[PDB]
Design a protein around this ligand. Sequence first.
Ligand SMILES: *[C@@H]1O[C@H](CO)[C@@H](O[C@H]2O[C@H](CO)[C@@H](O)[C@H](O[C@H]3O[C@H](CO)[C@@H](O)[C@H](O[C@H]4O[C@H](CO)[C@@H](O)[C@H](O)[C@@H]4O)[C@@H]3O)[C@@H]2O)[C@H](O)[C@H]1NC(C)=O
Ligand SMILES: COc1cc2c3c(ccc2cc1C#N)O[C@H](c1cc(F)c(F)cc1F)[C@@H](N)C3
Ligand SMILES: COc1cc2c3c(ccc2cc1C#N)O[C@H](c1cc(F)c(F)cc1F)[C@@H](N)C3
Ligand SMILES: *[C@@H]1O[C@H](CO)[C@@H](O)[C@H](O)[C@H]1NC(C)=O
Ligand SMILES: *[C@@H]1O[C@H](CO)[C@@H](O)[C@H](O)[C@H]1NC(C)=O
Lengths: 727, 727
Amino acid sequence: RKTYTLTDYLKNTYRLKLYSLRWISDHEYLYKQENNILVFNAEYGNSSVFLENSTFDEFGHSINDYSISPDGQFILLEYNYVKQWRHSYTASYDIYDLNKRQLITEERIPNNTQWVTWSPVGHKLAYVWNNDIYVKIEPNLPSYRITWTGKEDIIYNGITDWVYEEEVFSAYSALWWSPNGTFLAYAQFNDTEVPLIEYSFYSDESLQYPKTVRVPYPKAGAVNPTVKFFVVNTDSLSSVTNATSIQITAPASMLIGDHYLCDVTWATQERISLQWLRRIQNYSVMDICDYDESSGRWNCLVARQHIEMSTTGWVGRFRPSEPHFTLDGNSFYKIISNEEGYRHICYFQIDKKDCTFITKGTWEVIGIEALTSDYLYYISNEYKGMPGGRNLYKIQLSDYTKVTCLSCELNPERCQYYSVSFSKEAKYYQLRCSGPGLPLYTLHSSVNDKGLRVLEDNSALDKMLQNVQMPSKKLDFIILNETKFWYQMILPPHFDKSKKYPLLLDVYAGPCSQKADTVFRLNWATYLASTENIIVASFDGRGSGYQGDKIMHAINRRLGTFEVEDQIEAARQFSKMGFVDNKRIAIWGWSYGGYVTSMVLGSGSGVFKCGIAVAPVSRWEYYDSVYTERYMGLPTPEDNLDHYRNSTVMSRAENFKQVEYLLIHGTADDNVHFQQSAQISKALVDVGVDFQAMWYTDEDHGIASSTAHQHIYTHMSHFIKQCFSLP
Amino acid sequence: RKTYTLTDYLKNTYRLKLYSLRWISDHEYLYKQENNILVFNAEYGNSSVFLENSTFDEFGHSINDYSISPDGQFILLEYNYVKQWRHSYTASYDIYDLNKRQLITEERIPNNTQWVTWSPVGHKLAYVWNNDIYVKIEPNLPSYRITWTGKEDIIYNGITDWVYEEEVFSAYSALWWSPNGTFLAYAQFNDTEVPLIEYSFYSDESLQYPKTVRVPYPKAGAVNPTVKFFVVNTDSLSSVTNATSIQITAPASMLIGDHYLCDVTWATQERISLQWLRRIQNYSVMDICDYDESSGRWNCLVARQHIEMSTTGWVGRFRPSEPHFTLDGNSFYKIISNEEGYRHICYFQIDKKDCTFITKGTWEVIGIEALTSDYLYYISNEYKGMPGGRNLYKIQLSDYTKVTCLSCELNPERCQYYSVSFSKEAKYYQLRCSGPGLPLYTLHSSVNDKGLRVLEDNSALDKMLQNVQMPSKKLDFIILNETKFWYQMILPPHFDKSKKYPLLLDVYAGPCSQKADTVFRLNWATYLASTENIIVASFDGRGSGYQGDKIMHAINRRLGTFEVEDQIEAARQFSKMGFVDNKRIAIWGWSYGGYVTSMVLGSGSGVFKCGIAVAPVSRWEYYDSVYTERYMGLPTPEDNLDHYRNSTVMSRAENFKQVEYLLIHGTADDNVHFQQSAQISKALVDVGVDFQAMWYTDEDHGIASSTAHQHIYTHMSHFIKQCFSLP
Ligand SMILES: *[C@@H]1O[C@H](CO)[C@@H](O[C@H]2O[C@H](CO)[C@@H](O)[C@H](O[C@H]3O[C@H](CO)[C@@H](O)[C@H](O[C@H]4O[C@H](CO)[C@@H](O)[C@H](O)[C@@H]4O)[C@@H]3O)[C@@H]2O)[C@H](O)[C@H]1NC(C)=O
Ligand SMILES: COc1cc2c3c(ccc2cc1C#N)O[C@H](c1cc(F)c(F)cc1F)[C@@H](N)C3
Ligand SMILES: COc1cc2c3c(ccc2cc1C#N)O[C@H](c1cc(F)c(F)cc1F)[C@@H](N)C3
Ligand SMILES: *[C@@H]1O[C@H](CO)[C@@H](O)[C@H](O)[C@H]1NC(C)=O
Ligand SMILES: *[C@@H]1O[C@H](CO)[C@@H](O)[C@H](O)[C@H]1NC(C)=O
């Protein structure tokens, strides 16, 4: 048999298969296969061809992505894709009728549009061009302007600014249609007083002078952007006079200082939910607002207002959890950590402030996925008491003791990590199994809860991997200060406990992480074990997620303390197990893991020989406000400046004398500025420590352009092989 | 026994001694002992003690450098020196009185002062502050304001912008007293439409948002700064009425296009000479310009225009040569390249304009050092047909054929490399022998040409060095195309000719460079030969200078051609001598030889195992217009675009596949911008070539900071050691 090699991973020799589908009705879904968008049927297979390989064959453009209007007439066609940050990007748009086999020509959508969306019923459009919002009742009719305020790097109507895209909404889009599209809600951010990160972009070598990029980006302690919120009524627009947009202003609990808007969620045709959140992120307020068909303004009755606050840390996991209303929009289920530290479902009622918990236990609820008039469906890590694994549950709404696993025992040895995807009224759901066996995608009915057929079993792949010498995964735990803490090892094949193999520690360890899980992946780590016989290990100690607040909030206000000491104390444990060479212990990480790699090599620990750190944070005052202050407070004397300063990589430069270090960064990293590593290399130079570094011209935080991607992973390969002595 | 070590070199153990002085009369001069300013009579001994190793403990501030008034009465004092480009700085300035031992308070010279200088006779003063000229007649009294155009980054009055500073005057100063102190001329530089290089400066940990530095800088082709000249007189100044400057405008041979000011030289109290050079630098014009007691303006008579031009290449070694004038102002001597392309001395008489040559042969006048009614004194490389060497001669104005060498046989073994400084009217002079033996400082008398005393012979060092296994040096040549080309080698202690050594090839190789000399050096090569046993060898090939124009102009319009060829050629010669190990041959170099080293590695000859390039130029359109265009012409397709594009390091990427490369660059390089290396790296990553790289945070083109000077020489030494396989 052959061994998994570095090239298999770089030329992507052994591809996993998956089954991407869209639902479009309670009965039906879509699936391109050979570029043929088919329409599949859920009960039988009465299935039909919706769109040809070709058709658009003669577009003389690459169709970047597609979208159908939910009434079925039209299709949106996206191309000329030009990326911005993580989720943001600018594109060109053309619409196509399917009852007329024809494409629109008039009032078409202006090139370089920031975002496009359909209403949920019918075929109206909302789009954002040049920071402003536009609406199109019908695709061919002129477009209704809605804002004027929009200005590049100042005002943003209906799109997120830099920081709200990254660490709040995870989206560029900041619009929300009502259920039938009557209204359109939106958001407005203001960066006027927010300062600019500046950096260089070199480009094609043809370019003579290098460009500076200026991005409004508020670092810890700095002036942040502000947020306003409105709802406009789409069903009465005027050819003649402007559009009146009703502001639903925040509550006074929030208006007294820097706050954030963190959630927008419709309940009914005329009832919307808001969540807000103070800059000090331990205090959140929800608000339920009804339409007044007398004054078309919007009421949010203080009785219906809902508080959520934290005594042990910060509200939500990354943000306040999201509420799921019952069809009358008169109660709602929602994730809220109970009073033992564990995250479970609460059933609220629009007008009463106690909630009633419908789940109990030492395990957490990952997500509410769906809601009928007799069942709620949710995802937990309950099965066999493992926080690394995910499974699907339904709960009988007339009797909270009547509760049922639907995935656990379909096939428990191959399958332990499930997502679920629902038909438009939970008549059906697809299930996705990510591991530990080979992904298994399958289809089910909610009535019988009986599975109709297999969609994809990853068999092509199965057959090749009988040809490959492959690694093995212990997942298990160990006990400390009285507590279980999960790790995973990737073990080379024919792995023999006699022998003392070398050990790379793959780290992340930032708040609410999990690196110890039931998932199946072929990755770098697989190559190192398969081909270099290196044990790859990960470890979720304090800070880590899905195991309660007692374990998530340990690091609150004290980042770069317990997550570092825990990575170190787990390496100790691994040495003492004695199939590990206690002189060949290395460590690596990226982003937050690169920081923690950097703090651990700075620690004077004795334990590690080699380190590699990729776009690491080195000093929290350099990261942005919204992520940083959530866990750190504000960097003033009056609050938490002191930990801010003890917690910097720079203060540890002299101890790298004891280790071999490698430091890599993109020159054009918007997220964690090159600044951050600049400051590290400088401190190590000024106390005379030798070390290695690669810059990567013009890459960002992902370093994911194909060629940079082959370089880095090779370069790091050479460094590990080199320090471990592998020939 | 012990050897010369990286640490001796970095920590600067074995120090030379120089004997600097300041002639301040025809027969007296200053100089420190420790902390203490003596004046020394020349005839015999009088020491006088001009100032004390105390006196200035009084002062508070951290004094820096001193200047004295011609009439000997005042002394100017520098502090808060705050470093800028390569000659440009800012400082503060207090004036002490020497007759009193008082200190001027009422009306001083403000902080952040840019340049300041005494007139040549008496106690008159001119300075520049926010780009404006100011004169003081008396140091106790109210400054006179000369210009009001000055403006940061656009208008430079009495001082150079970045291009004139680096590439023409090698000076921040652009003022010119008349010899008796009356008139004062200055240059005004414009920079309105010169575009702007932009780069990051991180400063201390404590700075939260980096700083973007913005500097006006023309690259190849770009828009240059234009230039204007003026004379103003200093006896007729008015305190009611603003102060008049007379323009003197360039000749119309120059005015039709882009052109530069390349030299300013006063001949009489009322006659000035101005040299102009075209943008395309194969054509210069000299003007000679008398006063006019009646009009008040300056008259540049056109019988007195001397046109120097070129056809093999460019005018000058790097610019037009300077004139030395006959006391009366009516004739001058100037070095010019003759009909066979050797530089020698020409007598000109202002009205007739064919110069007569005073010297000839197959060797070259380095420079003209002094003029008496009787003799001309010059430095040259004639002695023994050796361009490496340097020696002082004198020639009789009454009879050319009669020329004495003042330095040749003085001390023939130890001393072949001379420089000189004469007293106010050439009665005495100091000699400076800088190699091949230890440096040796002496005093001489004109009338006798008498060897008065030895001022310093460095025997302190001489003892020390008899404890160490010092390397040895060979200087010598080879013959290519029936022409001599000089190499020097640094050879290890107890060099054994039957052995194989690895070989590093130090490189510069720029136009009119010279690496093969008889100078004496303690440097990184010293360390590499004595301690790690490497032969370190440089080579003076095509382009190199002081050997005339057939060799020098060979690269005309054609950089990165022959000089690269010849660097490979030289390494090939050396390996066939049979004490070289064909498998271990490196190359490296900073600045120009960074480029030359890159292009060698990128050439795919295979002769070089590995290489290191420090701050290289990778592509000529990234470099400044003045130096670049001087050797390439213009990057238009109606001039030299095709070579500009063929001569890039980046188009040689796929060959770096046969080599271990190490690329290094200061992030704040204001000259060769980090731009240049960024494009190299990107190129290599694209074709997939492993290399190693290092940035230096906020260092510039020198990487001179104490700690970084150390970091890089240590990093580089490791890299070579890897490559030659040495511990
Ligand atoms: C340094 O160099 C600068 C240019 O590089 C120079 O500034 C002159 O040039 C700028 C271009 O940057 C010009 O804008 C300006 O001159 C012109 O200004 C107007 C254009 O915006 C134009 O209307 C003017 O013409 C008018 O007035 C003149 C008389 O004043 C008449 O000839 C015209 O008919 C018309 O009525 C004018 O041509 C700048 O003067 C800086 O001055 C220079 N600084 C130095 C030398 O100190
Ligand atoms: C907006 O929501 C999220 C943001 C998340 C983020 C996560 C990791 C998980 C997240 C998960 C959610 C969620 N859900 O990590 C990101 C992150 C954290 C770092 F320390 C860092 F150096 C770079 C970086 F991108 C951070 N900027 C945003
Ligand atoms: C204006 O005067 C000079 C400038 C000189 C210069 C010399 C080398 C010798 C010089 C000699 C003189 C003289 N004389 O080289 C310098 C130089 C050349 C390069 F290719 C480069 F990348 C950087 C660099 F500083 C260039 N900036 C100016
Ligand atoms: C955005 O905020 C800025 C503060 O600089 C203010 O001047 C401007 O009026 C605001 N724009 C709005 C809210 O329309
Ligand atoms: C000198 O000229 C400047 C600017 O051109 C002007 O402001 C000033 O009045 C003049 N100075 C005096 C003292 O008249």
